[PDB]
Amino acid sequence: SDGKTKTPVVSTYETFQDGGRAKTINAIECPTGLNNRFAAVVSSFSTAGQNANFSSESAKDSQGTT
């Protein structure tokens, strides 16, 4: 694509684990001569902070701000 070699972009739906701890995602195996790329984009969010469970793609549980 425009002189640069690319792999097809692959997508995952991610939420943070309870505890406000950072999220670990394993990097895809890149073919020899390519480097890993990553992008995160917002789907659903609220201001509930820790009082929420967004791990379901079909509904969002939001219990409000502390």
Add this chain to the structure above:
Amino acid sequence: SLAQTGEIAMQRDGSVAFLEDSELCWDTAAGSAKSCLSVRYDTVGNKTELDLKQIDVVSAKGLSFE
């Protein structure tokens, strides 16, 4: 009514077709393992598959699909 056998030489006009489930292979530098491919038909689903999974990577320039 003629039929062709495995011994038939492949012609540059392509009039001779591969036998069903036969694999087009390369002698490759992999040592003892060729990198083959075939066009398979799946009776359940009625769909033709161009199987390249014996080759690790397929490297194209431009690429389009449907």
Add this chain to the structure above:
Amino acid sequence: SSNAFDVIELSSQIQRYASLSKINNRTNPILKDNKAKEFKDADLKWLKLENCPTAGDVPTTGNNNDLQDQFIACDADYRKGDLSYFGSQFEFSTYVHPSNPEIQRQIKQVVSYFQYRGMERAFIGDAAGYVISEAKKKGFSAQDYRIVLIEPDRVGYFESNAISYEEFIENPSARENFLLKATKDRTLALAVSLAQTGEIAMQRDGSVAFLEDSELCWDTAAGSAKSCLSVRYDTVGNKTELDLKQIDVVSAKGLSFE
């Protein structure tokens, strides 16, 4: 009264064996090594079926209700007559098989030797005339046809001195030159090589594989370089690559990747 016939029969059966990758739907045992040269013994145990009273080297289907392809009868012995079967020298090249890790080589050349135990060494020329006549009778071109003196080598033997069949018959100067060096450390023998050197056509059963680093091309009005493709290997990456970068656009319908 069958020595001239038997030399060509065994040689052609040895040549047939040399051209087969699988025998009775099982891997050819001579392709299951990695050595560049191997000598197969004159006893022809390596050419007899495994399902024989004394086990040979040729594999069977396992179920003996099918007709088992064989090359020589089980009691066959060609260490007879003026031209006595002496063994065969195989020369190999390293080879890449898609489905048998024990297959590491393919056959480059086979030369089968027949030592002359005739009354006079000079008479090997006549014995040569009958075999060559029987070979040409059955449609076989004898490649580099020669009377030879062979000595043991690291693997099998090597030809100390060799003379063309034409020179043994038409040049008495050259003939006695050759018969002279035939001493006790050498064995006087006939060297029988068959044919098939030219390049190979791709077959509709796909049994024939492309050669390494070869390119499959299309006539295009684009000229050159933009119509070909190949399967390349990366010696460090240990990955096979299907190189389509010579094609500008690849247009498929359905598409899946991993």
